[PDB]
Chains A and B, each alone.
Chain A
Amino acid sequence: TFQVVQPINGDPFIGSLETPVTSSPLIAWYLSNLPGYRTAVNPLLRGVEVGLAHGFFLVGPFVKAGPLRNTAYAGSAGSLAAAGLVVILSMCLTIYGISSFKEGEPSIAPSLTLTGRKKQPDQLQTADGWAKFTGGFFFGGISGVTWAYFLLYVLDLPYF
């Protein structure tokens, strides 16, 4: 009889299961194309994309819910707060990278695909790769915050 849920990769002794939420073709395609999962690309470029996307979002909540939301200084204060949060997150990423990775060691990413094919391990799991990722993320986040502020308060676009 047809059954949907199966053990992970056919091994019933590994602590996971394969469900439509995890292994649907649409879901599998969507996750494989996000920057965090492009193991064959320069980490700087993935970090720049992640920073751009995350910095663009942060402006909205700070602007709209902030203590100066009902004043003429709403946009500038919100954007400045978003930039500060981006700076704090960049500091956290740098600290994590320094703590976790040692210079000169090989990558610790897995080198086996789900079908058993051998692949080159991800370079994001090295000190140099994480440093590039963090420096891309900072530059991306600042650029996204600036773009959001520019669009919202330099061009009088019919938003809302």
Chain B
Amino acid sequence: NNLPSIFVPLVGLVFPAIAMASLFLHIQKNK
């Protein structure tokens, strides 16, 4: 199939970047 050519980069490069950016913004937040 062609699905692994999409989901492997999606889980290895895109989702980690989004999660790390969101988590850094969360931990750096103050009020």
- Chain A interface (Cβ < 8 Å from any Cβ of B): 91, 95, 98-99
Number of interface residues of B (CB under 8 A): 5
Closest-CB distance, B9 to chain A (whole angstroms):
12
- Judge whether B17 and A99 touch: CB under 8 Å: no
Q: Are B17 and A98 in contact (CB under 8 A)?
A: no
Q: Does A91 lie within 8 Å of B24, measured CB to CB? A: no
**Contact residues of B: prevailing secondary structure:** helix
Q: Is B21 an interface residue (CB 8 A)?
A: yes
Contacts of A99 in B (CB 8 A): 24-25, 28
- A95 close to B17 (CB less than 8 A): no
9 CB-based A-B contacts, threshold 8 Å: A91-B17, A91-B21, A95-B21, A95-B24, A95-B25, A98-B25, A99-B24, A99-B25, A99-B28
The B1-31 residues at the A interface (CB cut-off 8 A) are 17, 21, 24-25, 28
User: In the assembled complex, which residues on chain A have CB atoms less than 8 Å from the CB atom of B21?
Assistant: 91, 95
